[PDB]
Amino acid sequence: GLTEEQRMMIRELMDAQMKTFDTTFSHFKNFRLPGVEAAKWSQVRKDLCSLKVSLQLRGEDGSVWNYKPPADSGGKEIFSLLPHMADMSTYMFKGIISFAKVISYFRDLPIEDQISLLKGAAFELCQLRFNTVFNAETGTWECGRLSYCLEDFQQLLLEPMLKFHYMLKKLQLHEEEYVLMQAISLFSPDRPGVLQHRVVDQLQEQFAITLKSYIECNRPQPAHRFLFLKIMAMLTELRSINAQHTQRLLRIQDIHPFATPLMQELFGITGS
Numbered sequence: 605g606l607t608e609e610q611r612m613m614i615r616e617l618m619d620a621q622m623k624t625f626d627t628t629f630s631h632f633k634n635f636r637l638p639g640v641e642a643a644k645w646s647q648v649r650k651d652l653c654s655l656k657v658s659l660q661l662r663g664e665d666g667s668v669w670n671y672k673p674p675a676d677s678g679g680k681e682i683f684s685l686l687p688h689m690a691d692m693s694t695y696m697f698k699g700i701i702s703f704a705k706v707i708s709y710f711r712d713l714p715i716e717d718q719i720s721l722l723k724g725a726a727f728e729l730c731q732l733r734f735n736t737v738f739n740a741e742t743g744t745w746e747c748g749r750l751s752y753c754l755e756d757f758q759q760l761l762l763e764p765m766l767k768f769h770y771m772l773k774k775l776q777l778h779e780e781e782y783v784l785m786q787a788i789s790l791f792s793p794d795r796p797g798v799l800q801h802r803v804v805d806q807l808q809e810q811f812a813i814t815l816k817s818y819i820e821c822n823r824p825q826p827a828h829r830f831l832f833l834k835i836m837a838m839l840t841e842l843r844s845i846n847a848q849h850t851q852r853l854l855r856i857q858d859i860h861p862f863a864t865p866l867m868q869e870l871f872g873i874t875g876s
């Protein structure tokens with residue numbers, strides 16, 4: 605029940621997602637692994653310990669490596685998973701950049717609104733992709749042969765980002781709804797340094813209209829009443845999570861440098 609332009613819009617986004625999302629993480633390799641001012645630390649202490657994960661690697665031969673992280677003993681132990689996380693983030697960010705670049709609506713913006721929309725939304729698009737491999741019953745992100753298992757209840761969902769992943773997973777969205785959420789978020793007319801506000805705003809309104817129409821054509825069940833409005837509220841939450849994670853990343857980077865070159869680009873760090 606979508607117009608021809610709407611069906612075209614979904615097809616192009618589904619196509620860009622198919623070409624740039626390595627859902628089995630086959631091409632993520634060469635990554636680092638964990639080895640074998642007072643109020644600043646307390647804040648970074650608080651920052652890192654809210655999402656503790658164990659790590660699993662399944663070998664191509666049938667072997668398994670498992671990593672249980674240290675307990676908080678007040679020292680540098682809390683940074684042991686950071687270089688690995690930054691390699692995963694970088695790998696995810698590359699996929700996200702390729703996603704934007706293959707979308708015609710994105711390619712037709714000026715190069716400096718592109719860079720500035722990407723800086724605004726890279727974390728949000730990455731979290732949206734990670735929700736699709738998140739297993740809410742085991743508390744696990746299943747990334748191919750890599751697994752990231754949350755670490756022992758519902759106090760765990762006090763961390764807003766964990767609560768976001770569980771709430772988003774409960775809506776049981778289709779692939780099309782996920783990519784439309786990525787578009788609406790990528791084309792946010794109000795990111796720092798956007799110049800073509802009006803063009804980006806019309807594109808966004810239009811990805812939103814397609815999503816509302818998609819839901820109305822394909823989900824008549826009483827369970828998905830107001831589903832479109834739940835998605836828009838989740839996007840608002842994610843924008844907020846996104847700003848909190850940016851501050852926390854800069855606080856950590858301030859006392860313990862870890863960001864990759866691509867992360868420095870996306871987050872304003874100049875290397876000087």
Ligand SMILES: O=[S@]1OC[C@@H]2[C@H](CO1)[C@]1(Cl)C(Cl)=C(Cl)[C@@]2(Cl)C1(Cl)Cl
Pocket residue numbers: 655657689690692693694696730731734745752765
């Ligand atoms: O790409 S980055 O590195 C991956 C980590 C974070 C996202 O940023 C979180 Cl929040 C998510 Cl999502 C996953 Cl998956 C993990 Cl493992 C946790 Cl720590 Cl749960």
